[PDB]
Coordinates of C-alpha atoms and ligand atoms in Angstrom, one line a residue:
Chain A
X864 CA 56.2 -148.7 -73.6
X865 CA 58.5 -150.4 -71.1
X866 CA 58.1 -154.2 -71.3
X867 CA 55.8 -155.2 -68.5
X868 CA 57.5 -158.5 -67.9
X869 CA 60.9 -156.8 -67.3
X870 CA 61.1 -156.1 -63.5
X871 CA 64.3 -157.6 -62.0
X872 CA 67.0 -157.2 -64.7
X873 CA 70.7 -157.9 -65.0
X874 CA 73.3 -155.2 -64.6
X875 CA 74.6 -156.0 -68.1
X876 CA 71.3 -154.9 -69.7
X877 CA 72.3 -151.3 -68.8
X878 CA 74.9 -149.1 -70.5
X879 CA 75.5 -146.1 -68.3
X880 CA 75.9 -143.2 -70.7
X881 CA 76.2 -140.0 -68.7
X882 CA 76.5 -139.2 -65.0
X883 CA 73.7 -136.8 -64.1
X884 CA 74.9 -136.1 -60.5
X885 CA 75.9 -137.6 -57.2
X886 CA 73.8 -137.4 -54.1
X887 CA 74.3 -138.4 -50.5
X888 CA 73.1 -142.0 -50.8
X889 CA 73.4 -142.8 -54.5
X890 CA 74.2 -141.5 -58.0
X891 CA 72.0 -141.1 -61.0
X892 CA 72.8 -141.9 -64.7
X893 CA 71.3 -141.5 -68.1
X894 CA 71.5 -145.0 -69.5
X895 CA 70.5 -147.3 -72.4
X896 CA 68.6 -150.5 -71.5
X897 CA 68.9 -153.5 -73.9
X898 CA 70.7 -151.4 -76.6
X899 CA 67.5 -149.4 -77.4
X900 CA 65.7 -147.8 -74.4
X901 CA 66.8 -144.5 -72.9
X902 CA 66.3 -144.6 -69.1
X903 CA 67.5 -143.1 -65.8
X904 CA 69.4 -145.4 -63.4
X905 CA 69.8 -144.5 -59.7
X906 CA 72.7 -146.5 -58.3
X907 CA 72.6 -146.7 -54.6
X908 CA 75.8 -146.5 -52.6
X909 CA 77.0 -149.7 -50.9
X910 CA 75.4 -149.9 -47.4
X911 CA 72.5 -147.5 -48.3
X912 CA 69.8 -150.0 -48.9
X913 CA 68.9 -153.6 -48.2
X914 CA 68.0 -155.8 -51.2
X915 CA 65.2 -157.6 -49.4
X916 CA 63.8 -154.5 -47.8
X917 CA 63.9 -152.4 -51.0
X918 CA 62.4 -155.1 -53.1
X919 CA 59.5 -155.5 -50.7
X920 CA 58.9 -151.8 -50.9
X921 CA 59.7 -151.4 -54.6
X922 CA 56.9 -153.9 -55.3
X923 CA 54.5 -151.4 -53.7
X924 CA 56.1 -148.4 -55.5
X925 CA 55.9 -149.9 -58.9
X926 CA 52.1 -150.1 -58.6
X927 CA 51.9 -146.4 -58.0
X928 CA 51.4 -145.6 -61.6
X929 CA 50.2 -142.1 -62.4
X930 CA 51.0 -139.4 -65.0
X931 CA 52.5 -137.1 -62.2
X932 CA 54.7 -139.8 -60.7
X933 CA 58.0 -140.9 -62.1
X934 CA 57.6 -144.4 -63.7
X935 CA 59.6 -147.1 -61.8
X936 CA 60.6 -149.6 -64.6
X937 CA 63.0 -152.1 -63.2
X938 CA 65.6 -152.9 -60.5
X939 CA 69.0 -154.7 -60.2
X940 CA 69.2 -156.8 -57.1
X941 CA 73.0 -157.2 -57.1
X942 CA 74.8 -155.0 -54.6
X943 CA 74.5 -152.2 -54.7
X944 CA 70.9 -151.9 -55.9
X945 CA 70.0 -150.0 -59.2
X946 CA 66.6 -148.3 -59.6
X947 CA 65.6 -147.9 -63.2
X948 CA 63.0 -145.2 -64.2
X949 CA 61.9 -143.1 -67.1
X950 CA 64.3 -140.4 -68.1
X951 CA 63.2 -136.8 -67.4
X952 CA 65.0 -134.4 -69.8
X953 CA 65.0 -131.3 -67.6
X954 CA 66.2 -132.8 -64.4
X955 CA 65.0 -131.6 -61.0
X956 CA 62.5 -128.8 -60.6
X957 CA 64.9 -127.1 -58.2
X958 CA 67.6 -127.0 -60.8
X959 CA 65.1 -126.1 -63.5
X960 CA 63.8 -123.1 -61.5
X961 CA 67.4 -121.9 -61.1
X962 CA 68.3 -122.4 -64.8
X963 CA 68.1 -119.9 -67.6
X964 CA 64.9 -121.3 -69.1
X965 CA 63.1 -122.2 -65.8
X966 CA 63.8 -118.9 -64.1
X967 CA 61.7 -117.2 -66.8
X968 CA 58.5 -119.3 -66.3
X969 CA 55.6 -116.9 -65.7
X970 CA 53.4 -117.1 -62.7
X971 CA 50.7 -119.2 -64.4
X972 CA 53.3 -121.8 -65.3
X973 CA 54.5 -121.9 -61.7
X974 CA 50.9 -122.4 -60.5
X975 CA 50.5 -125.2 -63.2
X976 CA 53.7 -126.9 -61.8
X977 CA 52.2 -126.7 -58.3
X978 CA 48.9 -128.2 -59.5
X979 CA 50.6 -131.0 -61.3
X980 CA 52.5 -131.9 -58.1
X981 CA 49.4 -131.7 -56.0
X982 CA 47.6 -134.1 -58.4
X983 CA 50.4 -136.6 -58.0
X984 CA 50.3 -136.2 -54.2
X985 CA 46.5 -136.6 -54.3
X986 CA 47.1 -139.9 -56.1
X987 CA 49.5 -140.9 -53.3
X988 CA 47.0 -139.8 -50.8
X989 CA 44.2 -141.9 -52.4
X990 CA 46.5 -144.9 -52.5
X991 CA 47.2 -144.5 -48.7
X992 CA 51.0 -144.0 -49.4
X993 CA 53.4 -141.5 -48.0
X994 CA 56.2 -139.7 -49.8
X995 CA 58.3 -138.8 -46.7
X996 CA 60.7 -136.4 -48.6
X997 CA 58.7 -134.0 -50.7
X998 CA 60.7 -131.0 -52.0
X999 CA 61.7 -129.4 -55.3
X1000 CA 64.8 -131.5 -55.5
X1001 CA 62.6 -134.6 -55.6
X1002 CA 60.4 -133.3 -58.4
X1003 CA 61.5 -134.0 -62.0
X1004 CA 60.6 -132.1 -65.1
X1005 CA 60.1 -133.5 -68.6
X1006 CA 61.1 -132.1 -72.0
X1007 CA 57.6 -130.7 -72.4
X1008 CA 57.5 -129.2 -68.8
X1009 CA 55.5 -132.0 -67.1
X1010 CA 56.3 -132.3 -63.4
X1011 CA 56.6 -135.8 -61.9
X1012 CA 57.1 -136.8 -58.3
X1013 CA 60.3 -138.8 -57.6
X1014 CA 61.7 -140.8 -54.7
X1015 CA 58.2 -141.5 -53.3
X1016 CA 58.7 -143.6 -50.2
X1017 CA 62.4 -144.1 -50.8
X1018 CA 63.4 -142.5 -47.5
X1019 CA 61.8 -145.4 -45.7
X1020 CA 64.3 -147.9 -47.2
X1021 CA 67.5 -145.9 -46.8
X1022 CA 69.2 -147.5 -43.8
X1023 CA 70.7 -145.7 -40.9
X1024 CA 74.1 -147.3 -40.3
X1025 CA 77.8 -146.4 -40.2
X1026 CA 77.8 -146.0 -44.0
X1027 CA 74.9 -143.6 -44.4
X1028 CA 75.7 -141.6 -41.3
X1029 CA 78.8 -140.4 -43.0
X1030 CA 76.6 -138.6 -45.6
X1031 CA 74.9 -136.2 -43.2
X1032 CA 71.2 -135.2 -42.8
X1033 CA 68.8 -137.8 -44.0
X1034 CA 65.8 -135.4 -44.1
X1035 CA 66.1 -131.6 -44.2
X1036 CA 64.8 -129.8 -41.1
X1037 CA 63.4 -126.9 -43.1
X1038 CA 61.0 -129.0 -45.2
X1039 CA 59.9 -131.4 -42.4
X1040 CA 56.7 -130.9 -40.3
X1041 CA 57.4 -130.4 -36.6
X1042 CA 55.8 -133.7 -35.5
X1043 CA 58.0 -135.9 -37.8
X1044 CA 61.1 -134.1 -36.6
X1045 CA 60.1 -134.4 -33.0
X1046 CA 58.2 -137.7 -33.0
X1047 CA 59.0 -139.5 -36.3
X1048 CA 55.3 -139.2 -37.2
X1049 CA 55.5 -139.3 -41.0
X1050 CA 52.0 -139.3 -42.5
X1051 CA 50.3 -137.8 -45.5
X1052 CA 49.8 -134.8 -43.3
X1053 CA 53.5 -134.3 -42.8
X1054 CA 53.7 -134.5 -46.6
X1055 CA 51.1 -131.7 -46.7
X1056 CA 53.5 -129.5 -44.6
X1057 CA 56.4 -130.3 -46.9
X1058 CA 54.2 -129.4 -49.9
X1059 CA 53.7 -126.0 -48.4
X1060 CA 57.5 -125.5 -48.2
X1061 CA 57.7 -126.8 -51.8
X1062 CA 55.1 -124.2 -52.9
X1063 CA 57.3 -121.5 -51.4
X1064 CA 60.3 -123.0 -53.3
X1065 CA 58.4 -122.7 -56.6
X1066 CA 57.2 -119.2 -56.1
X1067 CA 60.7 -118.0 -55.2
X1068 CA 62.4 -119.9 -58.1
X1069 CA 64.3 -122.2 -55.7
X1070 CA 65.3 -120.0 -52.8
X1071 CA 66.4 -121.8 -49.6
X1072 CA 63.4 -122.0 -47.2
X1073 CA 63.7 -119.6 -44.2
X1074 CA 66.5 -117.4 -45.7
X1075 CA 69.0 -116.2 -43.1
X1076 CA 67.8 -118.7 -40.5
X1077 CA 69.6 -121.6 -39.0
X1078 CA 67.8 -124.9 -38.4
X1079 CA 67.4 -124.4 -34.6
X1080 CA 66.0 -120.9 -35.3
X1081 CA 63.5 -122.4 -37.7
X1082 CA 62.3 -125.0 -35.2
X1083 CA 61.9 -122.5 -32.3
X1084 CA 60.2 -119.9 -34.5
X1085 CA 57.7 -122.4 -35.8
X1086 CA 56.9 -123.3 -32.2
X1087 CA 56.0 -119.7 -31.6
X1088 CA 53.7 -119.4 -34.6
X1089 CA 56.2 -117.9 -37.0
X1090 CA 55.7 -118.9 -40.6
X1091 CA 57.6 -117.7 -43.7
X1092 CA 56.2 -114.3 -44.7
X1093 CA 54.6 -113.9 -48.2
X1094 CA 57.4 -113.0 -50.6
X1095 CA 57.4 -110.7 -53.6
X1096 CA 55.5 -111.8 -56.7
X1097 CA 53.5 -114.3 -54.6
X1098 CA 49.7 -114.0 -55.0
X1099 CA 47.7 -114.1 -51.8
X1100 CA 45.8 -117.1 -53.1
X1101 CA 49.0 -119.1 -53.2
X1102 CA 50.3 -117.9 -49.8
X1103 CA 47.0 -118.8 -48.2
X1104 CA 47.4 -122.4 -49.4
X1105 CA 50.9 -122.5 -47.8
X1106 CA 49.5 -121.3 -44.5
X1107 CA 46.9 -124.0 -44.5
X1108 CA 49.6 -126.6 -45.1
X1109 CA 51.6 -125.3 -42.1
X1110 CA 48.9 -125.7 -39.5
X1111 CA 50.5 -126.9 -36.2
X1112 CA 47.9 -129.7 -35.8
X1113 CA 48.3 -132.3 -38.6
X1114 CA 44.6 -133.1 -38.7
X1115 CA 43.9 -129.4 -39.4
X1116 CA 46.0 -129.4 -42.6
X1117 CA 44.1 -129.8 -45.9
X1118 CA 43.9 -132.9 -48.0
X1119 CA 45.9 -133.0 -51.3
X1120 CA 42.5 -133.5 -53.0
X1121 CA 41.5 -130.1 -51.6
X1122 CA 44.9 -128.6 -52.5
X1123 CA 44.8 -129.8 -56.1
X1124 CA 41.3 -128.4 -56.5
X1125 CA 42.2 -124.9 -55.2
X1126 CA 45.4 -124.8 -57.2
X1127 CA 43.5 -125.8 -60.3
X1128 CA 41.0 -122.9 -59.7
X1129 CA 43.9 -120.4 -59.3
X1130 CA 45.6 -121.6 -62.5
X1131 CA 42.6 -120.8 -64.6
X1132 CA 42.1 -117.5 -62.9
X1133 CA 45.8 -116.7 -63.8
Chain B
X24 CA 72.8 -115.9 3.4
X25 CA 73.9 -119.5 3.1
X26 CA 72.0 -122.5 4.3
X27 CA 72.5 -123.7 7.9
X28 CA 74.6 -126.9 8.1
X29 CA 72.5 -128.6 10.8
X30 CA 69.1 -128.0 9.3
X31 CA 68.8 -131.3 7.3
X32 CA 65.4 -132.9 8.1
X33 CA 63.0 -129.9 8.4
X34 CA 59.3 -129.7 9.1
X35 CA 56.9 -129.1 6.2
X36 CA 55.7 -126.0 8.0
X37 CA 59.1 -124.3 7.6
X38 CA 58.3 -124.0 3.8
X39 CA 56.0 -121.5 2.1
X40 CA 55.4 -122.8 -1.4
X41 CA 55.3 -119.6 -3.6
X42 CA 55.0 -120.7 -7.2
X43 CA 54.8 -124.0 -9.1
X44 CA 57.6 -124.1 -11.6
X45 CA 56.3 -127.2 -13.4
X46 CA 54.9 -130.7 -13.0
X47 CA 57.0 -133.7 -13.9
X48 CA 56.4 -137.4 -14.1
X49 CA 57.3 -138.4 -10.6
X50 CA 57.0 -135.0 -8.7
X51 CA 56.5 -131.3 -8.9
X52 CA 59.0 -128.4 -8.3
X53 CA 58.1 -125.2 -6.5
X54 CA 59.8 -121.9 -5.8
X55 CA 59.5 -121.5 -2.0
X56 CA 60.6 -119.5 1.0
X57 CA 62.2 -121.4 3.9
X58 CA 61.8 -120.0 7.4
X59 CA 60.6 -116.7 6.1
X60 CA 63.9 -115.6 4.7
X61 CA 65.6 -118.2 2.4
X62 CA 64.7 -118.5 -1.2
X63 CA 64.8 -122.2 -2.3
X64 CA 63.4 -124.7 -4.7
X65 CA 61.3 -127.6 -3.4
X66 CA 60.8 -130.8 -5.4
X67 CA 57.7 -132.5 -4.0
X68 CA 57.6 -136.2 -4.9
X69 CA 54.3 -137.8 -5.9
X70 CA 52.9 -140.3 -3.4
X71 CA 54.3 -143.7 -4.2
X72 CA 57.4 -142.4 -6.1
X73 CA 59.9 -142.8 -3.3
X74 CA 60.5 -144.6 0.0
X75 CA 61.5 -142.3 2.8
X76 CA 64.0 -144.8 4.2
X77 CA 65.6 -145.6 0.9
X78 CA 65.7 -141.9 -0.1
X79 CA 67.2 -140.8 3.2
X80 CA 70.0 -143.4 2.8
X81 CA 70.8 -142.1 -0.7
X82 CA 70.1 -138.4 0.2
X83 CA 72.8 -138.7 2.9
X84 CA 75.2 -139.6 0.1
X85 CA 74.0 -136.9 -2.3
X86 CA 74.3 -134.1 0.2
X87 CA 78.0 -134.8 0.5
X88 CA 78.4 -134.2 -3.3
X89 CA 79.2 -130.5 -2.8
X90 CA 80.7 -128.8 -5.8
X91 CA 80.2 -125.5 -7.7
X92 CA 78.7 -127.3 -10.7
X93 CA 76.3 -129.5 -8.7
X94 CA 73.0 -128.2 -7.4
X95 CA 73.2 -127.9 -3.6
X96 CA 71.0 -130.3 -1.7
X97 CA 69.9 -128.4 1.4
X98 CA 67.2 -130.3 3.2
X99 CA 64.5 -132.9 3.1
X100 CA 61.0 -133.4 4.5
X101 CA 60.4 -137.0 5.6
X102 CA 56.6 -137.0 5.9
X103 CA 54.9 -138.6 3.0
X104 CA 55.4 -137.6 0.3
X105 CA 59.0 -136.6 0.4
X106 CA 60.2 -133.0 -0.3
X107 CA 63.7 -132.3 -1.6
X108 CA 64.9 -128.7 -0.8
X109 CA 67.7 -127.3 -2.9
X110 CA 69.1 -124.0 -4.0
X111 CA 67.0 -122.0 -6.5
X112 CA 68.3 -121.7 -10.0
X113 CA 66.7 -118.6 -11.6
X114 CA 66.9 -119.6 -15.3
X115 CA 65.4 -123.1 -14.9
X116 CA 66.6 -126.0 -16.9
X117 CA 69.2 -125.8 -19.6
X118 CA 66.8 -127.4 -22.0
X119 CA 64.3 -124.7 -21.5
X120 CA 67.0 -122.0 -21.5
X121 CA 68.3 -123.1 -24.8
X122 CA 64.8 -122.9 -26.2
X123 CA 64.1 -119.4 -24.7
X124 CA 64.6 -116.0 -26.3
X125 CA 67.7 -115.3 -24.3
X126 CA 69.3 -118.7 -24.4
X127 CA 68.7 -119.3 -28.1
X128 CA 71.1 -116.3 -28.7
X129 CA 74.0 -117.7 -26.7
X130 CA 77.1 -117.7 -29.0
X131 CA 79.1 -120.8 -29.7
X132 CA 81.8 -120.0 -27.1
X133 CA 79.0 -119.8 -24.5
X134 CA 77.7 -123.2 -25.5
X135 CA 81.2 -124.6 -25.1
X136 CA 81.4 -122.8 -21.7
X137 CA 78.1 -124.6 -20.7
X138 CA 79.5 -128.0 -21.8
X139 CA 82.8 -127.5 -19.9
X140 CA 80.9 -126.5 -16.7
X141 CA 78.8 -129.7 -16.9
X142 CA 81.9 -131.8 -17.7
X143 CA 83.5 -130.3 -14.6
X144 CA 80.6 -131.4 -12.4
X145 CA 80.6 -134.8 -13.9
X146 CA 84.4 -135.1 -13.4
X147 CA 83.6 -134.5 -9.7
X148 CA 80.9 -137.2 -9.7
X149 CA 83.4 -139.4 -11.4
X150 CA 86.1 -138.7 -8.8
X151 CA 83.6 -139.4 -6.0
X152 CA 82.7 -142.8 -7.6
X153 CA 79.1 -141.7 -8.0
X154 CA 76.8 -142.2 -11.0
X155 CA 74.3 -139.7 -12.3
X156 CA 72.0 -142.2 -14.1
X157 CA 69.9 -139.6 -15.9
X158 CA 72.1 -137.0 -17.5
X159 CA 70.4 -134.7 -20.1
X160 CA 69.7 -131.0 -20.7
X161 CA 66.5 -131.3 -18.7
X162 CA 68.5 -132.2 -15.7
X163 CA 70.9 -129.3 -15.9
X164 CA 69.9 -126.1 -14.2
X165 CA 71.1 -122.5 -15.1
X166 CA 71.6 -119.7 -12.6
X167 CA 71.0 -116.0 -13.0
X168 CA 74.6 -115.5 -14.0
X169 CA 74.5 -118.4 -16.4
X170 CA 76.3 -121.0 -14.3
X171 CA 75.3 -124.5 -15.2
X172 CA 74.7 -127.0 -12.3
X173 CA 73.9 -130.7 -12.4
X174 CA 70.6 -131.7 -10.9
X175 CA 68.9 -135.0 -10.0
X176 CA 72.3 -136.8 -9.6
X177 CA 71.5 -140.3 -8.5
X178 CA 67.8 -139.7 -8.1
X179 CA 66.7 -142.2 -10.7
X180 CA 68.0 -145.0 -8.4
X181 CA 65.5 -144.2 -5.7
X182 CA 62.5 -143.8 -7.9
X183 CA 60.4 -146.9 -7.2
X184 CA 59.0 -149.1 -10.0
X185 CA 55.4 -149.9 -8.8
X186 CA 51.8 -149.5 -9.8
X187 CA 52.0 -145.7 -9.1
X188 CA 55.1 -144.8 -11.1
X189 CA 54.3 -147.2 -14.0
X190 CA 51.4 -144.9 -14.9
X191 CA 53.9 -142.0 -15.6
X192 CA 55.5 -143.6 -18.6
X193 CA 59.2 -144.1 -19.3
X194 CA 61.6 -143.8 -16.4
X195 CA 64.7 -143.2 -18.5
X196 CA 64.6 -142.0 -22.1
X197 CA 65.9 -144.4 -24.7
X198 CA 67.7 -141.9 -26.9
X199 CA 69.8 -140.6 -24.0
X200 CA 70.8 -144.0 -22.6
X201 CA 73.8 -146.1 -23.4
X202 CA 73.0 -149.4 -25.1
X203 CA 74.4 -151.6 -22.3
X204 CA 72.3 -149.7 -19.8
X205 CA 69.1 -150.3 -21.8
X206 CA 70.0 -153.9 -22.6
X207 CA 71.4 -155.1 -19.3
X208 CA 70.7 -152.4 -16.7
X209 CA 74.4 -151.6 -16.7
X210 CA 74.5 -148.0 -15.3
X211 CA 78.0 -146.8 -14.7
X212 CA 80.0 -143.6 -15.0
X213 CA 80.6 -144.8 -18.6
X214 CA 76.9 -144.8 -19.4
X215 CA 76.9 -141.3 -18.0
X216 CA 79.6 -140.5 -20.6
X217 CA 77.4 -141.7 -23.4
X218 CA 74.5 -139.6 -22.1
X219 CA 76.9 -136.6 -21.9
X220 CA 77.6 -137.0 -25.6
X221 CA 73.8 -136.8 -26.3
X222 CA 73.7 -133.7 -24.0
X223 CA 76.5 -132.1 -26.0
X224 CA 74.4 -132.6 -29.1
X225 CA 71.5 -131.0 -27.3
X226 CA 73.6 -128.0 -26.4
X227 CA 74.9 -127.3 -29.9
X228 CA 71.5 -127.7 -31.4
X229 CA 69.8 -125.5 -28.8
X230 CA 67.6 -128.3 -27.5
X231 CA 66.6 -130.3 -30.5
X232 CA 65.3 -133.8 -29.8
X233 CA 68.1 -136.4 -30.3
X234 CA 67.9 -138.5 -33.4
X235 CA 65.3 -136.2 -35.2
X236 CA 62.8 -138.2 -37.3
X237 CA 63.6 -141.5 -35.6
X238 CA 61.6 -143.7 -33.4
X239 CA 63.1 -145.3 -30.3
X240 CA 63.3 -148.8 -32.0
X241 CA 65.0 -147.1 -35.0
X242 CA 67.6 -145.5 -32.8
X243 CA 68.4 -148.8 -31.0
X244 CA 68.8 -150.8 -34.2
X245 CA 70.8 -148.0 -36.0
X246 CA 73.2 -147.7 -33.1
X247 CA 73.8 -151.4 -33.2
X248 CA 74.9 -151.0 -36.8
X249 CA 77.3 -148.2 -36.1
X250 CA 75.0 -145.3 -36.9
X251 CA 75.7 -142.2 -34.8
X252 CA 74.0 -138.8 -35.2
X253 CA 75.8 -136.9 -38.0
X254 CA 77.4 -133.6 -37.2
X255 CA 74.8 -130.8 -37.4
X256 CA 75.0 -127.2 -38.6
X257 CA 77.3 -124.9 -36.6
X258 CA 78.9 -127.7 -34.8
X259 CA 82.7 -127.5 -34.8
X260 CA 84.4 -130.8 -35.7
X261 CA 86.3 -130.5 -32.3
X262 CA 83.0 -130.7 -30.4
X263 CA 81.6 -133.5 -32.7
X264 CA 84.8 -135.5 -32.2
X265 CA 84.1 -135.4 -28.4
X266 CA 80.6 -136.7 -29.0
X267 CA 81.8 -139.6 -31.0
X268 CA 84.3 -140.6 -28.3
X269 CA 81.4 -140.6 -25.9
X270 CA 79.4 -142.9 -28.1
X271 CA 81.9 -145.8 -28.4
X272 CA 80.1 -149.1 -28.3
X273 CA 82.5 -150.5 -25.6
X274 CA 82.0 -148.7 -22.3
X275 CA 85.7 -149.0 -21.3
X276 CA 86.7 -147.2 -24.6
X277 CA 84.7 -144.1 -23.7
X278 CA 86.8 -141.3 -22.3
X279 CA 86.8 -140.2 -18.7
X280 CA 85.1 -137.0 -17.7
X281 CA 88.5 -135.7 -16.5
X282 CA 89.5 -136.0 -20.2
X283 CA 86.3 -134.5 -21.5
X284 CA 86.6 -131.5 -19.2
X285 CA 90.2 -130.9 -20.2
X286 CA 89.5 -131.0 -23.9
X287 CA 86.4 -128.9 -23.7
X288 CA 88.3 -126.3 -21.7
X289 CA 90.9 -126.2 -24.5
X290 CA 88.3 -125.8 -27.1
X291 CA 86.6 -123.0 -25.1
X292 CA 89.6 -120.7 -25.0
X293 CA 90.2 -121.4 -28.7
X294 CA 86.7 -120.2 -29.5
Ligands
VSE1998 C1 73.2 -129.4 -59.2 N1 72.2 -130.5 -59.5 C2 72.8 -131.5 -60.3 C3 71.8 -132.6 -60.7 N2 71.3 -133.2 -59.5 C4 70.3 -134.3 -59.8 C5 70.9 -135.3 -60.7 C6 69.9 -136.5 -60.8 C7 68.6 -136.0 -61.5 N3 67.7 -137.1 -61.7 C8 67.2 -137.9 -60.7 C9 66.3 -138.9 -61.2 C10 65.8 -140.0 -60.5 C11 66.0 -141.3 -61.0 C12 65.5 -142.4 -60.3 C13 64.9 -142.2 -59.0 O1 64.4 -143.3 -58.3 C14 63.1 -143.4 -57.9 C15 62.1 -142.9 -58.6 C16 60.8 -143.0 -58.1 C17 60.5 -143.7 -56.9 C18 61.6 -144.2 -56.2 C19 62.9 -144.1 -56.7 C20 64.7 -140.9 -58.6 C21 65.2 -139.8 -59.3 C22 66.2 -138.6 -62.6 C23 65.6 -139.1 -63.7 N4 64.6 -140.2 -63.6 N5 65.7 -138.5 -64.9 C24 66.6 -137.5 -65.1 N6 67.2 -137.0 -64.1 C25 67.1 -137.5 -62.8 C26 68.0 -134.8 -60.7 C27 69.0 -133.7 -60.5 C28 70.7 -132.2 -58.6 C29 71.7 -131.1 -58.3
VSE1999 C1 58.4 -126.6 -19.9 N1 59.3 -126.7 -18.8 C2 58.7 -126.2 -17.6 C3 59.7 -126.2 -16.4 N2 60.1 -127.6 -16.2 C4 61.1 -127.7 -15.1 C5 60.4 -127.2 -13.8 C6 61.3 -127.4 -12.6 C7 62.6 -126.6 -12.8 N3 63.5 -126.9 -11.6 C8 63.9 -128.1 -11.1 C9 64.7 -127.9 -10.1 C10 65.1 -128.9 -9.2 C11 64.9 -128.9 -7.8 C12 65.2 -129.9 -7.0 C13 65.8 -131.0 -7.5 O1 66.2 -132.1 -6.7 C14 67.4 -132.7 -6.6 C15 68.6 -131.9 -6.8 C16 69.8 -132.6 -6.8 C17 69.9 -133.9 -6.4 C18 68.7 -134.6 -6.2 C19 67.5 -134.0 -6.3 C20 66.1 -131.1 -8.9 C21 65.7 -130.1 -9.7 C22 64.9 -126.5 -9.9 C23 65.7 -125.7 -9.1 N4 66.5 -126.2 -8.0 N5 65.6 -124.3 -9.3 C24 64.8 -123.8 -10.2 N6 64.1 -124.6 -11.0 C25 64.2 -125.9 -10.9 C26 63.3 -127.0 -14.1 C27 62.3 -126.8 -15.3 C28 60.7 -128.1 -17.4 C29 59.7 -128.1 -18.5

């Protein structure tokens, strides 16, 4: 139980133990808080995030408490910002699906992963929040194989400046619904499109979306009604959900409440 | 057979509009036949979009801007509303071509070829102390043999701002326009250079929107803080370096089109 009164904490309360990896806009560490609590710490790169803007958003994030969302524990306000969360022992779902243990998960387990993520996104949907960067790399997996959504809303507070431009694409074209690419219209419905791509990621154990296709080829193909074909070992029930998520009109995409209910039914059937 | 060089102001009756090519904000464009034998394009301006006297004054400058990489301005019709008669370009706009089945398959050397052709045309405009004012892939035309020609050069200056054109939305697009042109109406050959950089990104991405995922306010504030579009997939560093030169904050620090044309010509043969 993280101490409820510990929100803005000093940097010295954290002992960074092990570097888990380096991303575009920050690094993540396994750490010990106050000599006793194992946590994860995301240290943002200098210039990636404003303290005032992040804190204003992080005070919304921290209220998004749900079993399928990574728990946001604390922050460090000194530059550059630290984000302190629960530690997830099996890392990202993308890495897990491409590991020895995760590549062997049977189809019912894959459906269960998808249903867990859908339940978390249904919570975000009910709370009138938006993830903005849903993909398997932003799903974390616990020691007992519970999937939790990470980085919810974080893309909104990563600044676009000379420092972050050096790091490349902020959002990946292949996961992003057409209207957010073309019009910056990020909504829960653009999250629904991304969830469809994530579902394909899960069923393919982490294959790149649209294999063999460049980003321009993906955009133009989607405009002509192309959608990723159903791959091997993908049940039609699962593929049909993906196709619903990839409707061209955002308003015609299903709710996450609908998605979770259908995924839950297909889990028990499998 | 080439256009006759004393047929400038022509009667509307000399034109047979054959097929509408598309409807724009301030006018429409038609494939037409002139005098029963000459295939042309006709841009018919919407009523209220242009003054006949102001247009004629500018059109008499535009018609002297004759160059292989600029669309040839043949004739005009002065009765309201104005018609602009030019050569016909069989593959339409470069933006549409890059998003078509055939144009989406153009190899990288061809994309560099297109860039160098446009740069050659802009170097001519630069040498003639003219200003395009609305350079983007939508305003480049492509011929049957894949020659790229610059269209609408100078036309934005004679589109009126009134109750009629205000209903058509934004006159110039924010994400294509140099900051000093947005902020102070400072349209120069150097703001064209900025726009050419955005056009070069359009070409290498086969027509993607500039600044994907970003609103217009987000683009303006990001640029003020040194953000520039990152190098995309399958964009050589040579080409991206030219874009970055075009996007210098200070206009006088942007290269000339004579420089851009020479560097793109070098990179073309290398590819
Ligand atoms: C080749 N791989 C190497 C490992 N790389 C990544 C390294 C960091 C890993 N990682 C990332 C996280 C992690 C930590 C904090 C965080 O911040 C927010 C959370 C919610 C809302 C807003 C912000 C988001 C994510 C993580 C973790 N908590 N517990 C355990 N591991 C974690 C996820 C994998 C991925 C590529
Ligand atoms: C979805 N698409 C549908 C097609 N839309 C456009 C429709 C009009 C097309 N189009 C436009 C032109 C065209 C014609 C006249 C003209 O006027 C000036 C030229 C130079 C200087 C000043 C004025 C400018 C451009 C065109 C063409 N010449 N020959 C062949 N096609 C042409 C270019 C594409 C673009 C959007």
